[PDB]
Structure 1
Amino acid sequence: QFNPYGDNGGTILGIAGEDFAVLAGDTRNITDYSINSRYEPKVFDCGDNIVMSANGFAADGDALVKRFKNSVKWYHFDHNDKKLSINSAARNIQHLLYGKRFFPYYVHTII
């Protein structure tokens, strides 16, 4: 049987300071016991001073980040270049993820 999911490993970490925030991730990409890449960026600048990472199954992670980046683009078009606040971004990402409630994006996301 075809299994649509995989596990590309990795680990990510968000920490919120007083007037800053960090989003860290390791750069290793794996499948089973093989290393795919020693430097495959996982944490992305999405514009509007938001950083994002969708760690787990890298194909679903890339798909989600790509869709959110695009969501930011269309948020500018549709609402007069308004800055997407982090709380708004979060709610938008909930709807992206829940949209595939019955065929999930196999990732733990942090912004």
Structure 2
Amino acid sequence: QFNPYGDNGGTILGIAGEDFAVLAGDTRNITDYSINSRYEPKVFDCGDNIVMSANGFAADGDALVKRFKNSVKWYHFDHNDKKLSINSAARNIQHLLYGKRFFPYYVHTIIAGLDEDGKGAVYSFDPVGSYEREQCRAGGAAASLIMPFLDNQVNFKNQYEPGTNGKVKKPLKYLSVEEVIKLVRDSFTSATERHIQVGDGLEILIVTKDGVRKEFYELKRD
């Protein structure tokens, strides 16, 4: 019997800052126990200061990104070159995903950018289009490894202040872009160690009011 789905591995990570947002993803692409590519870009600049990644089955992932990029283009044509806001992009993506509710895009989608108040924004989707704005989200194969670490080190979960002993929580101080990139790099290094589908390279897209910047880092190739 023909199986229309496959698993290309990989892992992605979005973190929303106070006036910035990052969307990271490893550059490894796999099937079963083989490496297809050590550098296959997975996070994309879709225009209007929005970055996107659809992790899981790469064919569906590419198809969805391609269709969303198309949606941005036609949004400009139909509405006098108006900038597509991150919240509007998120709702549009829900309809793209739910449109194939009974033959789903087998992907975990994350977009990142800035909201209309200039604050950092990350939105996260399931395969059939349910979405939610979040301060923090990891997606893909090693999501189960990375998310708990982010609950702890980004939202200070289960952390309290010394001397008080469980009475006073650790205050939720904001994180700079330099501080976030450190957490992203450590997240992927840790994931690479214990997950076989994660490695080769890490590509981070940083979104600010100035635009979209890129950073690349080497990961273990075994």
Confirm or deny a common fold (TM above 0.5). Answer: yes
C-alpha distance after superposition, 1:13-32 (max 9, x if no partner): 00000000000000000000
Q: Which runs of 4+ in 1 moved over 3 A?
A: none
What is the identity percentage for the equivalent residue pairs of Structure 1 and Structure 2? Answer: 100
Match in the other structure for 1:27: 27
Deviation at 1:64, TM superposition (A): 0.1
Return the alpha-carbon distance in structure 2 between the equivalents of residues 33 and 81 of structure 1. 46
Q: Distance in 2 between matches of 1:21 and 1:33?
A: 33
3-state DSSP class of the match of 2:52?
Answer: strand
Give, in whole Å, the separation in 1 of the partners of 2:33 and 2:53. 23
2:38 is matched with which residue?
A: 38
Aligned to 1:14, the other structure's residue is in SS state strand
- The Cα of 1:84 is off from its aligned counterpart by 0.1
Give the superposition deviation at 1:5: 0.1
Question: How does the TM-score come out when normalised to structure 2?
Answer: 0.50
Instruction: Report the CA distance between 1:107 and its aligned residue.
Output: 0.1
1: distance between equivalents of 2:34 and 2:21? 33
Q: CA separation in 1, counterparts of 2:80 and 2:22?
A: 29
Q: What whole-Å deviation, never above 9, does each CA across 1:50-108 have from its counterpart, x for those lacking one?
A: 00000000000000000000000000000000000000000000000000000000000
Cα deviations by residue, 1:1-54 (Å, 9 ceiling, x for unpaired): 000000000000000000000000000000000000000000000000000000
Q: Matches of 1:102 and 1:48 in 2, distance apart? A: 31
Q: CA RMSD in A?
A: 0.1
